Nucleic acid binder design. Structure first.
Lengths: 85, 200, 113, 94
RNA sequence: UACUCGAGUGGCGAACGGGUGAGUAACACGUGGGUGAUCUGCCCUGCACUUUGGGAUAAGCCUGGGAAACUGGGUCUAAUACCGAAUACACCCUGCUGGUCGCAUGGCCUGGUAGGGGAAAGCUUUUGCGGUGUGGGAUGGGCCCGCGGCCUAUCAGCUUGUUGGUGGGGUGAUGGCCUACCAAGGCGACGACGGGUAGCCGGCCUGAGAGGGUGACCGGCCACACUGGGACUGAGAUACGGCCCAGACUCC
């Protein structure tokens, strides 16, 4: 509030947060759909949406929004429960 | 804070020739004052006090600075009393007194005080400088026209030069060769009681 | 980065600097990793002692000195020993050692007699 | 001229964990046991040599260890809270 | 006209540095370890690259509202900003499999392998600066453990997310760190659970020596920023001179 760089930085981080909230919400939609697919047993749709969610996680980590270790644990859970169903 | 009182005073008190030419000392060795004839109590403490009293009043230094020299002396690997005495004799002014350029210990103190020496290319107005082996003490430039010192250098027939000094200078250039040692010093009271006091 | 620095030491008038290799997020007289040299400017030919091998190591691993240290390394040729542009050329003025105590006093004796 | 894309990492000595050697007291939980380890230190003031006592909870995947045993143990990463060690081998039966 | 530059976007720094010792009897500190249980902008080192496509806006201009702090809409412009797509097949998810070292899960041979995906930015006329993924460094750190360091039973019972386990979630990572479920277990006379005090250490003072006291200065760690909480951005935040909320306190 008292440093002008901090003011600029405020509005900047507001923009950034907005962007990243939207990113995470989208990813969360993707995984919720995948879990519902697995849970009703559309194995076809399971893979047909897994491909989407997997590319989505990869390019999420690529933007530095989240770490590749996190993205890997996510994809691992997806892949494993798809293997089990 | 240099001392200022009569040299006769401590002399009449404790009873030692330290100045040399003290006819009042010869005339009245008893202590001064109203009870100057009166009698004093004996102990270990009085003796051990009187020891350092005589020494440090002979040489001018104060109690606390003597204690600093003592800390160094028992910090040495040698032995406290005699190495203290070697330290204490290593002073500049005492060296030049035993060389004999000066009349009184006060006078040597004053000479070194007023910057009348010139040691290896630096003015040294330091009445307590420590002189190790191989120290070429030349004297300064204006040292010539000091009148009582002219008489001094000319007819310096007072107390002799000891073994560990010499003058190899037409300009009265005094040099150290070895350091003082107590077997050859032969000065008044030895410092064992001093050691016992300062490590009381 | 792990910058090769000079750090102050001593008293108010005459500084004496130690050549250290530490992180940039330290402070001026703070913790180090390796004291490797030093630098005494207060005398005009300005003593400089630099453990050459260890400086070469630290330049290899990815250090990045500041300008004054770089000047010193180029003086000694350590930067030039790392980069080999002309060669590892020592420009270092070792200070003129003085006529020692013994030779002085023997000169006094032989002159006076 | 073209440097190697790859470079293997230096040989790292995989550190040497400790071991402790105690007497089992319980298997009243699942897949874990409690071991009363012991160490002879010296009292750092009066110099006397002192036996002490130390509970330490361990784990075995296959439940070999019973009560009244003498075991070998090795330290490992935390299996869970107040589980830090693992069994090596039931060492002197009884 | 751009040498230059108010303001603006855009990076970068601001988390270092600097201060205090209220709290804290805690892996907070000191020493010695472990990571097969982990992240690392910056600096260097290597390897392979740096293609194409697109929209909108801040400013500026017009205008409204408010006491001010500030906000609103219409219009317009730009990019290393945001967003796409195409490659990488060195990296990552999963399936099958040979060998090898182990200290068990496992680690390694850029292991092979059917197969799925993931990058990027252009300025510069002068010592020239860059940007992307990727392996190996060096530096910083996060996590766990042993051990040592005050008083007090006129502080004897304490414990239910507590103790172990299964399936999941969660973080950079192990982990009751969280979740529903199974057993009922755990801690304690070597002082739990409580109370009082207190930042820790290299050190400083004394002492023959042990030991006792003690934590000025300087150096290294921890914690704090009016009080109490929370999250964001981001390589990395107790985010002192940032945000939000509720108080208390001073002003308009």
């Amino acid at each position: 509030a008292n440093i002008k760089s901090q003011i600029k930085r405020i509005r900047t981080n507001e923009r950034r947060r907005l962007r990243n909230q939207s990113v995470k919400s989208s990813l969360r939609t993707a995984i919720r759909g995948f879990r519902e697919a697995v849970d009703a047993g559309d194995k076809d749709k399971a893979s047909e949406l897994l491909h989407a969610t997997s590319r989505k996680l990869d390019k999420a980590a690529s933007k530095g929004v989240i770490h590749p270790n996190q993205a890997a644990n996510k994809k691992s859970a997806l892949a494993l429960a798809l293997n089990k169903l | 804070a240099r001392y200022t009182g009569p040299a006769t005073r401590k002399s009449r008190r404790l009873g030692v020739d330290l100045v040399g030419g003290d006819q009042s000392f010869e005339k009245r060795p008893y202590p001064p004052g109203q009870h100057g004839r009166a009698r004093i109590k004996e102990s270990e403490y009085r003796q051990q006090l009187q020891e350092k009293q005589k020494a440090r009043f002979s040489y001018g230094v104060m109690e606390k600075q003597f204690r600093r020299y003592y800390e160094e002396a028992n910090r040495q690997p040698g032995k406290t009393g005699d190495n203290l005495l070697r330290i204490l004799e290593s002073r500049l002014d005492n060296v030049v007194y035993r060389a004999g350029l000066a009349r009184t210990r006060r006078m040597a103190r004053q000479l070194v005080s007023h910057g009348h020496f010139l040691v290896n290319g630096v003015k040294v107005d330091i009445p307590s400088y420590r002189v190790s082996q191989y120290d070429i003490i030349d004297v300064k430039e204006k040292s010539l026209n000091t009148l009582p010192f002219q008489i001094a250098r000319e007819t310096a027939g007072e107390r002799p030069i000891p073994s560990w000094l010499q003058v190899v200078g037409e300009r009265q250039r005094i040099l150290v060769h070895q350091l003082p040692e107590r077997a050859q010093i032969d000065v008044p009271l030895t410092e064992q009681l001093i050691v016992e006091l300062y490590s009381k | 980065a792990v910058k090769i620095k000079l750090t102050r030491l001593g008293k108010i008038r005459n500084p004496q600097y130690r050549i250290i290799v530490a992180d940039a997020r330290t402070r001026r007289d703070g913790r180090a990793i390796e004291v490797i040299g030093r630098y005494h400017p207060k005398e005009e030919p300005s003593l400089i002692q630099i453990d050459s091998e260890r400086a070469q190591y630290w330049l290899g691993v990815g250090a990045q000195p500041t300008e004054p240290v770089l000047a010193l390394l180029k003086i000694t040729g350590d930067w030039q020993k790392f980069k080999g542009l002309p060669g590892a050329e020592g420009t270092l003025k070792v200070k003129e050692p003085k006529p020692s105590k013994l030779d002085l006093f023997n000169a006094a004796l032989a002159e006076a007699e | 001229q073209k440097g190697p894309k790859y470079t293997p990492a230096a040989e790292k000595p995989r550190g040497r964990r400790k071991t402790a050697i105690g007497y089992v007291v319980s298997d009243k939980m699942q897949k874990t046991i409690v071991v009363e380890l012991e160490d002879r230190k010296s009292h750092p003031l009066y110099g006397k040599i002192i036996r002490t006592t130390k509970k330490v909870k361990a784990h075995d995947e296959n439940g070999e260890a019973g009560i009244g045993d003498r075991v070998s143990l090795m330290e490992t990463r935390p299996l869970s809270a107040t589980k830090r060690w693992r069994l090596v081998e039931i060492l002197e039966k009884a």
